[PDB]
Design a protein around this ligand. Structure first.
Ligand SMILES: Nc1ncnc2c1ncn2[C@@H]1O[C@H](COP(=O)(O)OP(=O)(O)OP(=O)(O)O)[C@@H](O)[C@H]1O
Ligand SMILES: [Mg+2]
Lengths: 329, 50, 514, 464, 464, 50, 50
């Protein structure tokens, strides 16, 4: 009886690997057929339309104390900006970046300045003596709140000063009416520096002298807003990857506007109608205004893929090929 | 037990030969079936008629 | 064959559909030694099955402010930094059903015996809660192991939790395999109330050892009703960690349907040794013997899922036979100390008894069953209640073996009795006795019929007597079996046939008997 | 307003709270588990403040299925048990939720399990003796009103029967109440206890709190305080004397060490928590007599490695005042309640607390039983005839003494049908004084078994 | 495109790579050392991914001379070593380079050191006995042809001489192919093996891979896998039966324990890596034999501090079918080969396989020696004349069994001067059956010591 | 490659250099001796351990 | 001051052992249960004293 079951199971294993190889050949031939079908632009348009219509039918790193302190610092920056002007914001961003460099270099000063206290008055006085003659008074008025508040780590004070300088530069960009161009260029440079891993890794020079990275940016890489932002960021990079830093710059820009960036992948650039339909559909899905950073690629031929936040909605010939290929018996 | 073991080994050899012949014969047809299966799966993978 | 080969693929094609549903994504930041740290997955839940793009699985056993620590269940090599990790909506869950009977499965319910795919009947989470105080019932009916030294002195009732604690190569696997083999006489009768099912969870065994156990069960027909959950040492720490919960789920499905189940954990020491690896790799704080703090909660939440259910829940039961490997007989180590306190009883195997010729080597007097006589049929209670007393008196008198002639007659008799009871409890492996037979075996001893047989012949005398009575006087075994009591008339006929046989029996010295 | 889970590492859970809403430690917080197969209202106990509005907590239930960012609501109070006369007759978990009837007791007054022991000025300055009425207990190992008794039980040595007996004793003689703290209880034997006390109909006088082994060490630790808080209500408010059973205290220490390791604290000696003695005292210093009413306790106590120097049993024995030990070697003789008169002991058996006559009688009984426990070797190896006329004149008294320590007791009333006897203390002393002097040698051993005193001894002997 | 070293600490190295060029786990990286006599190309194995595109690697060769910022190039594949009939008769290092003739293997087929073990479907339990001709082995711990044999033993108790003797006995007559992995083994005995195999001409069928203890942890780890992959080639791709010797397998885990703390693994118990069981299983499961193609493994296992409770031996025990078990106690009594007959064990020693004639004698010998070890404590203090006549006769038989289990091994010529002996299995069973039944109690105790069989026993007894 | 384990209890009781012949060993053995010593001392360690 | 006696709002006292650059690790005397985040702690001005 063991032999009888053994021969039956040998037969069953034979038919099973038969079915497996036949399914593999079938899915490979279907892959070739659909890869030939994907060549036509009308077919890609149909695929993206089907996926878009289907969809139509369908600060974080910081801990609590630093989070509250950064929120309050931005609330005061709101009051400062309500009276600011472009020419003044230009200097505000540079002076905030200068004090960020100071705190990043004179670490002994920074550790005292970031001390968590409610009676922070001495720290303010320490700043008042040290900076009152070096930088304009508005920067001091904002750094007063930056220092008085509480921070979870000595790093978050520098982070908040850098963030405030970045917001001031972005506010200059917004008042000048370049809100869209600066975002476009930030994403352009994001994808560039993500595709150029040699110069971008060389930009993460926080072990090397920063002015070299600054001059390298000036030589290699334009609206003066994006250039100022990149130069400030590489000057204050503190070991973060340059590409992931510039992409965070763009994320912050679009989130400051109020929207969120949804990265899109497709075989080719769609017409304006598809872009507007996709933006409206994504806004419906996630309940916010949105901007699409189309990272077109041929490898993901067919369909349409989107990733926003930590979530994905993916449709492509390749992803559905993976789904079909992994389901074989 | 030894006699039954010999019978089992004979069954195993018969299985080997029968399944080799059946595998060849059935793969002969599977080669044809594969074209239609792949044609239909090309439609299912695309999510539209092809 | 061709028709079904093509039809299966045709139906697969027909049933394929779009995966358009949105899902959350993470990315691996660290990977090493079986652990992967995944950033993102904000909505992840503890113990959630993550899937990595090479077709790999993780458990999401640790969640930090910004990272998820996932133990990897297999093929860890294929993981890399930057890999897109998707989350399933599901906590650790395994298929269950009668199809698992006769199969070897990994801790995810996937077949590893190389036979066809298992027909899943249902799916159960590995970590559902145990039956509470109000759902359970008293452990009143036996789980016959077919080992004389257990069923007579440390009995196991179905619903009990009995620890096979001992050294290496001392007969633990042997004892539990005999327990599994003995259930066939119950299985062959299609009454689910008698019919026991078995699950042999192999943790950290080498493949050929699991195969040896499978062959020993096939040789005994136990694969009609026995499942093996195999975490061979080749497989990741996570598989060794989840094998017992997979077995417990497979058994719990049968238990809640009203079947009776026997779970053998072989060995829980390596379950703990695997959870320790997982925990130390996840940087959890260590404690005694480098185990994590919850190493008790690891085993308790397992063994306490063994229970006997009330009539309101079908009356089912799951009987745990956990095995543990002690080091230098230190039953005082951490994990042994834990399981000794979690389990209802302990069948201590010891290497000295094993070498002295006392096999299955249970160190009676130290071994105990807190359930006690409730796990025995009335006949076995009556016949074996005196056995523990006689063996304790022998455990005292054995020092006087040198002076058996000076010893007082009343205790000289007890010494001669004890030696023969010890020989009576010896038993070769893979030869479990039905209760009907070991009732008579113990009756030969406690009622003093062996007293004239030379000690060295006892094992054969019994083996001959039961062969005579089994073949010629079956009504005795039939009575004990069908009425669970050794009635006075059957006792008298049993004594008559014992003397009938004992006149023909011949011993080593050629002497006569009585 | 409410908090958020931010880290989960097994039973340990970290909860972020706003600046001004952080809970004080040992508070109970509730969280959601919504995945259907594991849905729960997870209970968390705040153990530490990690700083930055973030609190490190230990879970009372399996954290499987918890999600980061899930809402956590502070109850504003510690784990609180229902207290009252209504908890008698019911079985509870460590969190004060009934198993027999979910949702029961939620209407009762709730007392936080974390409360300080009686003030120094409220304690009793001298050790009163507990007249339970059991001969062997009253004579050889007098219990203490407000003290603790180790109970070295075992399999099939009558532990549950002695438990039922002391429950009946306190409930009927003292008009009191009993609370059974099952720490690390095997679910099987917990159900066995539930059904056995229901059959004996003593459940109506007992409140059971089971921290089952199924549960993380948080509840296996806090259940002793849960039961002790029910007892503290019965003592402080209802004015009853109480008998708090703990089974097993070593598992309370073990769960404390497991929680210590989970929270990240460096282990002490053998591997217990550094706070070992501090929390063992928090539990034990609270079982005491106040304002004329007391909580007595019988604590089943494991002893790892049989080492009475290990920090856990050593710390346990620093508190408890008596030691009752049950032996199979005595149970197998039919001597119920099977208290081993020689292994057992009490710190009150000194002529300062007990009277001088009591001490002398108990010491003579111990001397006779020691002689017999030494002679049993000769009895077994050489027979009784090997003993001299004086050694036999002693053994004849020893047999009858050890028999007379047996008693027809209210727990046996379930099976023998005969009522359980309560023997006054003076009568026990005046019985064993005469019995040791040999005034009853002429009676057969069968006359002394399971008899409730001296007048009952006569009633049995003259009829036999 | 290429990477750069960032940090160096002992044999472990940290290497940064561009975002998309990070190498997979267990890939081989090459980095140059450019100082003087140390100048060499350095192989590193990727052990971990540390994030930020960093990867942590173990240097197969000493890091002395290595410089921060130096370029590192990934091979795109794991460590690969030559496989084929041509590697027989040659000596290799873990990296697969020939020690004897540099550059020899660079044209062979190269197999990755790392590969999954065979499926559970490919495995069957082996039951064929292997006759070695050593009394103790063939009787009490018989070996399995196609199984995983082991020679446990503390430091100095003779593992290396025993493994070389097993090579002399098996690999000499064995018709198939043989492989010898020197894992953390002494170089001197490796050379003695090389020249002995060369003299016996067995070398033509023996492939040697040496990672001797002078080599850093990386190569001490991967040398076992490099020899095992040649064994696995001879198994899978050719079918020719194989022998795989390994001295000493313990070092494989030990090397890991040296790197674990550098790799950022928290240490476990007495101080091994937490992965201990996982690594040891991933290695041992590959040494198995699939159906129809055998590998007869013979791996000597070091036992730290002679403590068989050490996690490493305790985990190794699981992966073996026959465990010869040396001990310093037996070695101190001159009972070389020093096998502890009571500790040693074998799965094949069942009457169903070895036959009742063999099993009976083996179990009787074990019973006698166990009683002897039980009685030694008495004998040392009380004396021999204080025993029963039966215990005393058993003692005089056990003392002779102990010394007859000793054997003049051929590899132990330098230990004894006299030539070595091979004792057939039938004669072993006959001799020990006679011994256990007292047919040699009249011979002097010294006649059994280091004698090969009954004829030599008689000749030596008549020489005394 | 060998051990000369000097036991203090042998040193005290007059056995000096105090080599514990039983645990001490030289695994090169006879190859580290001249032929004469291999003759006269070929098994001295085993004789003294026994 | 080091080993200064600090008072916490619940009337509780503690000993200032570890004076860090910006923090003061103290051992609490009495009911540490009453101590929690954000509580104002103030100086007694007295070194650990009775
Ligand atoms: N009851 C028995 N009678 C005779 N021999 C036995 C018995 N039980 C076990 N043995 C012998 O002991 C050996 C098996 O031991 P077993 O496999 O039970 O140990 P184990 O607990 O499984 O150890 P490990 O799990 O470490 O392998 C075999 O050689 C077998 O013949
Ligand atoms: Mg086993």
């Amino acid at each position: 009886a063991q032999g009888a079951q053994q021969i039956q199971l040998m037969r069953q294993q034979l038919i099973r690997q038969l079915r497996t190889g036949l399914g593999a050949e079938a899915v490979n031939k279907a892959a070739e057929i659909v890869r030939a079908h994907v060549a036509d632009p009308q077919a890609q348009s149909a695929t993206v339309d089907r996926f878009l219509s289907e969809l139509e039918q369908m600060t974080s790193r910081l801990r609590a104390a630093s989070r509250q302190s950064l929120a309050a610092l931005v609330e005061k920056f709101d009051s400062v900006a309500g009276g600011l002007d472009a020419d003044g914001l230009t200097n505000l961003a540079d002076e905030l970046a200068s004090v960020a460099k100071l705190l990043l270099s004179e670490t002994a000063l920074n550790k005292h300045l970031a001390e968590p206290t409610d009676d922070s008055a001495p720290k303010v006085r320490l700043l008042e003596r040290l900076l009152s003659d070096k930088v304009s008074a508005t920067t001091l008025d904002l750094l007063r709140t930056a220092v008085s508040n509480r921070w979870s780590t000595e790093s978050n004070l520098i982070d908040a000063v850098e963030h405030t300088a970045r917001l001031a530069l972005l506010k200059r960009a917004e008042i000048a009416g370049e809100v869209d161009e600066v975002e476009e260029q930030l994403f352009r440079f994001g994808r560039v520096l993500d595709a150029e891993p040699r110069l971008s890794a060389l930009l993460s020079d926080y072990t090397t002298p920063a002015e070299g990275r600054v001059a390298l940016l000036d030589k290699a890489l334009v609206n003066q807003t994006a250039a100022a932002l990149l130069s400030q960021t590489v000057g204050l990079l503190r070991g973060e990857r340059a590409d992931e830093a510039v992409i965070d710059l763009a994320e912050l820009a679009v989130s400051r506007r109020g929207e969120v960036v949804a990265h899109v992948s497709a075989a080719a650039e769609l017409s304006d109608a598809q872009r507007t339909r996709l933006t409206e559909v994504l806004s419906r899905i996630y309940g916010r205004p949105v901007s699409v950073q189309l990272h077109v690629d041929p490898e993901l031929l067919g369909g349409l893929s989107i990733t926003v936040g930590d979530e994905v909605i993916d449709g492509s010939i390749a992803s559905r090929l993976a789904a079909a290929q992994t389901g074989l018996p | 037990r030894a006699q039954a073991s010999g019978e089992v080994a004979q069954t195993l050899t018969q299985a080997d030969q029968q399944l080799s012949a059946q595998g060849d014969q059935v793969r002969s047809g599977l080669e044809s079936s594969v074209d239609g299966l792949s044609a239909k799966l090309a439609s299912r993978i695309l999510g539209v008629d092809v | 064959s061709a028709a079904d080969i093509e039809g299966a693929i045709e139906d697969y094609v027909s049933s394929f559909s779009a995966d358009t549903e949105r899902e959350e994504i993470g990315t691996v930041i660290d990977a090493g030694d079986g652990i992967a740290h995944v950033e993102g997955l904000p909505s992840v839940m503890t113990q959630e099955l993550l899937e990595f793009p090479g077709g790999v699985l993780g458990v999401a056993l640790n969640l930090d402010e910004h990272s998820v620590g996932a133990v990897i269940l297999g093929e860890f090599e294929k993981i890399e930094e930057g890999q897109q990790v998707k989350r399933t909506g599901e906590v650790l869950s395994v298929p269950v059903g009668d199809a698992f009977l006769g199969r070897v499965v990994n801790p995810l319910g996937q077949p590893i015996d190389g036979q066809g795919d298992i027909a899943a009947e249902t799916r159960r989470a590995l970590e559902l809660q145990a039956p509470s105080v109000v759902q359970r019932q008293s452990v009143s009916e036996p789980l016959q192991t077919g080992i004389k030294a257990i069923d007579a002195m440390t009995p196991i009732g179905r619903g009990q939790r009995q620890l096979i604690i001992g050294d290496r190569k001392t007969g633990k696997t042997a004892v539990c395999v005999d327990t599994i083999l003995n259930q066939r006489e119950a299985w062959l009768t299609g009454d689910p109330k008698q019919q026991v099912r078995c699950v042999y969870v192999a943790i950290g065994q080498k493949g050929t050892t699991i195969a040896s156990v499978k062959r020993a069960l096939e040789e005994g027909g136990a694969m009609e009703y026995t499942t093996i959950v195999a975490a061979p040492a080749s497989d990741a720490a996570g598989f060794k960690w989840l094998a017992p919960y997979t077995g417990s789920a497979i058994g719990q499905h049968w238990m809640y349907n009203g079947k009776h189940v026997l779970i053998v954990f072989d060995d829980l020491s390596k379950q703990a040794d695997a959870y320790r690896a997982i925990s130390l790799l996840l940087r959890r704080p260590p404690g005694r013997e480098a185990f994590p703090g919850d190493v008790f909660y690891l085993h308790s939440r397992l063994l306490e899922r063994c229970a006997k259910l009330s009539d309101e829940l079908g009356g089912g039961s799951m009987t745990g036979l956990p095995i543990i490997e002690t080091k230098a007989n230190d039953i005082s180590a951490f994990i042994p100390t834990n399981v000794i306190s979690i389990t209802d009883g302990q069948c201590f195997l010891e290497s000295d008894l094993f070498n002295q010729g006392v096999r299955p080597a249970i160190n009676v007097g130290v071994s105990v069953s807190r359930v006690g006589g409730a796990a025995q049929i009335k006949a076995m209670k009556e016949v074996a209640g005196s056995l523990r007393l006689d063996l304790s008196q022998y455990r005292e008198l054995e020092a006087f073996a040198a002076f058996a002639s000076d010893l007082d007659a009343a205790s000289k008799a007890q010494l001669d009795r004890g030696a023969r009871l010890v020989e009576l409890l010896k038993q070769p492996q893979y030869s479990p006795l039905a209760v009907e037979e070991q009732v008579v075996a113990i009756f030969l001893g406690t009622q003093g019929h062996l007293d004239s047989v030379p000690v060295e012949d006892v094992q054969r005398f019994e083996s001959e007597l039961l062969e005579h009575v089994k073949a010629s006087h079956s009504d005795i075994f039939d009575g004990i079996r069908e009425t669970k009591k050794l009635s006075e008339e059957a006792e008298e006929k049993l004594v008559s046939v014992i003397n009938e046989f004992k006149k023909g029996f011949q011993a080593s010295d050629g002497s006569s008997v009585v | 307003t409410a908090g958020r889970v931010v880290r989960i590492t097994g039973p340990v859970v970290d909860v972020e709270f706003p600046r001004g809403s952080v809970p004080e430690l040992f508070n109970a917080l509730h969280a959601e588990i919504t995945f259907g197969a594991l849905a729960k209202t997870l209970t968390l106990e705040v153990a530490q403040h990690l700083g930055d509005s973030l609190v490190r907590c230990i879970s009372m239930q399996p954290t499987d299925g918890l999600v980061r960012g899930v809402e956590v609501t502070d109850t504003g109070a510690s784990i609180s048990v229902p207290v009252g006369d209504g908890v008698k007759g019911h079985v509870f978990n460590a969190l004060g939720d009934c198993l027999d009837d979910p949702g029961y007791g939620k209407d009762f007054e709730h007392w936080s399990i974390h409360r300080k022991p009686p003030a120094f000025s409220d304690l009793e300055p001298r050790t009163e003796m507990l007249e339970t009425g059991l001969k062997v207990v009253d004579l050889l190992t007098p219990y203490v009103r407000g003290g603790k008794i180790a109970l070295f039980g075992g399999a099939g040595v009558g532990k549950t029967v002695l438990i039922q007996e002391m429950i009946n004793r306190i409930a009927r003689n003292f008009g009191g109440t009993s609370v059974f703290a099952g720490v690390g209880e095997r679910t099987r034997e917990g159900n066995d206890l539930w059904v056995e006390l229901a059959d004996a109909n003593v459940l109506k006088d007992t409140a059971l709190v089971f921290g089952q082994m199924d549960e993380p060490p948080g509840t296996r630790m806090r259940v002793a305080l849960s039961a002790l808080t029910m007892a503290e209500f019965f003592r402080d408010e209802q004015g009853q004397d109480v008998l708090l059973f703990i089974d097993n205290i070593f598992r309370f220490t073990q769960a404390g060490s497991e929680v210590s390791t989970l929270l990240g604290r460096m282990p002490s000696a053998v591997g217990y928590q550094p706070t070992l003695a501090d929390e063992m005292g928090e539990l034990q210093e609270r079982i005491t007599s106040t304002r004329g009413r007391s909580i007595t306790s019988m604590q089943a106590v494991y002893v790892p490695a049989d080492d009475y120097t290990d920090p856990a049993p050593a710390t346990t024995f620093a508190h408890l005042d008596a030691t009752t030990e049950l032996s199979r070697a005595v149970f197998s003789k039919g001597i119920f309640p099977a208290v081993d008169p020689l292994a057992s002991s009490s710190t009150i058996l000194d002529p300062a607390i007990v009277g001088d006559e009591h001490y002398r009688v108990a010491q003579e009984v111990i001397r006779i039983l020691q002689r017999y426990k030494d002679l049993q070797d000769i009895i077994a190896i050489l027979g009784i005839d090997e003993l001299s006329e004086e050694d036999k004149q002693l053994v004849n008294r020893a047999r009858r003494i050890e028999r007379f320590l047996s008693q027809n007791m209210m727990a046996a009333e379930q099976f023998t049908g005969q009522p359980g006897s309560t023997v006054p203390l003076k009568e026990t002393i005046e019985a064993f004084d005469k019995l040791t002097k040999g005034e009853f040698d002429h009676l057969p051993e069968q006359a002394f078994f399971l008899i409730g005193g001296l007048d009952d001894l006569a009633k049995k002997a003259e009829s036999l």
